[PDB]
Ligand binder design. Sequence first.
Ligand SMILES: [Mg+2]
Ligand SMILES: [Mg+2]
Ligand SMILES: [Mg+2]
Ligand SMILES: [Mg+2]
Ligand SMILES: [Mg+2]
Ligand SMILES: [Mg+2]
Ligand SMILES: [Mg+2]
Ligand SMILES: [Mg+2]
Ligand SMILES: [Mg+2]
Ligand SMILES: [Mg+2]
Ligand SMILES: [Mg+2]
Lengths: 70, 145
Amino acid sequence: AKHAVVLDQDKFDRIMKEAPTYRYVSVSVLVDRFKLGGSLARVALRHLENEGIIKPVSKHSKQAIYTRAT
Amino acid sequence: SLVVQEQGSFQHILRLLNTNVDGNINVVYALTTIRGVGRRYANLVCKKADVDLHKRAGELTQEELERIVQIMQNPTHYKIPAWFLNRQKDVNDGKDYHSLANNLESKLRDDLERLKKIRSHRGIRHFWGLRVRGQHTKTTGRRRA
RNA sequence: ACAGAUUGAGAGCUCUUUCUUGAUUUUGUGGGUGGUGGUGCAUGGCCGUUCUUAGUUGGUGGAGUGAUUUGUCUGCUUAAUUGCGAUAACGAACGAGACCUUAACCUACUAAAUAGGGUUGCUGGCACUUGCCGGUUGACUCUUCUUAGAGGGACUAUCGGUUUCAAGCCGAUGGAAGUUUGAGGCAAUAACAGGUCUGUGAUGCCCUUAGACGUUCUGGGCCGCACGCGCGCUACACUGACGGAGCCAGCGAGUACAACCUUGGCCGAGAGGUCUGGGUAAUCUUGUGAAACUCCGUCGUGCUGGGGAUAGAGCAUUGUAAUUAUUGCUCUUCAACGAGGAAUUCCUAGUAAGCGCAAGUCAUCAGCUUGCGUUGAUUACGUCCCUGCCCUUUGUACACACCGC
RNA sequence: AAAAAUGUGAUCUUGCUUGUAAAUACAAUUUUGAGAGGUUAAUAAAUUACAAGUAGUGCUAUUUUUGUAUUUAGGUUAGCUAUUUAGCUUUACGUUCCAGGAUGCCUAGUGGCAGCCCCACAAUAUCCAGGAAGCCCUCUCUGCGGCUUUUCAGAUUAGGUAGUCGAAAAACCUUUACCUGCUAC
Ligand SMILES: [Mg+2]
Ligand SMILES: [Mg+2]
Ligand SMILES: [Mg+2]
Ligand SMILES: [Mg+2]
Ligand SMILES: [Mg+2]
Ligand SMILES: [Mg+2]
Ligand SMILES: [Mg+2]
Ligand SMILES: [Mg+2]
Ligand SMILES: [Mg+2]
Ligand SMILES: [Mg+2]
Ligand SMILES: [Mg+2]
């Protein structure tokens, strides 16, 4: 294993800081900027799409392209 | 669904049934990793327990683990059809049963011994260190145990 | 020829037996008969290969005493000895082409409740205005799709260049079609000591020829494994895997003296059981709602949920018989393999590759095969570098022809 | 590392010329299936450690405070090639495997959304270029393919010659080469 699968509060905070920035957020992009692995990344992305912040471009399974507001 | 908030870090690698349950990953996967549990069976066990298959589950609870262990131990007591098993129909006139760890290995060994004793064609083949289920070794598998 | 010993063995196979059977036979000697016995280098037929390449022939006439040769060729064309041309050659035949079958077009004909639609009846649901989707072989009518009969239609057509302004080729236009329109079927002369005497009551000769190398039963074996190569399949995952959901083909095939395909209903996690049908078949299986695909979710680049081998057990089915797993299903085991070196195969368009179906064999077994459709690219549209083959000119102590002498 | 202060004949720390104390472990897949005989020949590496002869510099430097640390971190060859600011391998040296110790520029980088957040590009040499398995080989623990043979034959094929293969006792660790086969109304 290459790590980047372990989950923390601190990690979450860093992820949050922040949804803003980055032209596009793609599970792939998230990993590996060395963030939480695949599923985790996806979850994070989903969360980010709750109330604004990052709006979508594509919606497909695994090809999930999102971009910053607004 | 949800990212694991809170401090976390609840034990990397758990020890269960004299074998290594791997941390994070998923309960089913852990079960599979144990010498004797497979995929479908693992899934079934998980279902019985009532835990999400989405969760990584190295942060599992103790009670849940215990329940799982119990399930592994006992086919007939819980709702498992009893033809879904590793072993079934064995000894003189009696019951179907299976193990899932070290226990499973032991059972297998016992079975092998029995076969050897019998000196059946299969048993003979086993003794030889050869091809029990009549597959043609004219060309294929040129190395062997 | 019952009875048990006998015998693998309710093989009278016999030796224990002492009953049947009536001139079939049977004991010899001529004489056949059978043989998945031999020899394909004794043959037939069929097939493969030279070669599906472009080659082959003879009638005159000319050149040679002659074997022979020319025609049958410098060139340029063509897939083609295809043509145009040049010409002791002229006109011909075979082979190629034409031909045939199929694959494409037909709102133009002939046709249909065993093919499909339109109006309308009854009838289900909707919005609720008249309108939308349906279901019913209730009526009436149609032939576009369907089939499949008869015909047409493409001839490189029109135009442009290019080429001794020839054969042709190259590009635009139209056209269903412009690669010989695509794909095959057939396919010359001469052959090979290529294969098959284990398709053959096709067969020469030899062998064998009643304890057979005939037949026939029974149990195995073709499947064994230190290991080589040859077709193949499955994978090395993220263009994925797994779940759901969407959901579309074409070739076919399929029983009454058997047991075929088998919907529809209930049981079973499955496999598979059962009852019932429909079908001798554009009618029923069957719209074979085949896969690969498409959508939303779960794992995220870890020999991982990639990969599925070997394994153990049980549940099924086929058959007389499943251990040397027949095959299917259920759980469990999780091996090798992170795109493969030297080498070498196949391929030019609905092709390649992927994907499944399909019949063939078949009681039961698909990784095989002949077909089928579905998804559908990359790169040439050239050349003789290699490989093979073909010719020409050359040289030849070869002619059983370089495995030569 | 930061800081307050005691004291040493004011104080402080850049290496030069010497000899001894120690870390390159362990091995196995392989080597001709097991044992013995040689790390044959060759050969010490700068690396750390104490002290000299002081260029240095007076050698030895003590008593007490602040924090989990707050310190400054990361990485270099060797060969082949007219892909020569690039391509391919990438610790070679009997065959198979090996690793960095430090004089140093390193450098707290330049690019792509620098921002910490990942990608790639940039840090001469190296002193040694050294250690482990294998290392020309010879007797053993005494191996299975020879020695002849006699019996035959499988055959080798169109026919044949010469060799070769298969089943029975004694020391030693190829099924191919070559000769010979056919004609007019
Ligand atoms: Mg016969
Ligand atoms: Mg015969
Ligand atoms: Mg022949
Ligand atoms: Mg022959
Ligand atoms: Mg003449
Ligand atoms: Mg001629
Ligand atoms: Mg013209
Ligand atoms: Mg044609
Ligand atoms: Mg039909
Ligand atoms: Mg696995
Ligand atoms: Mg087959």
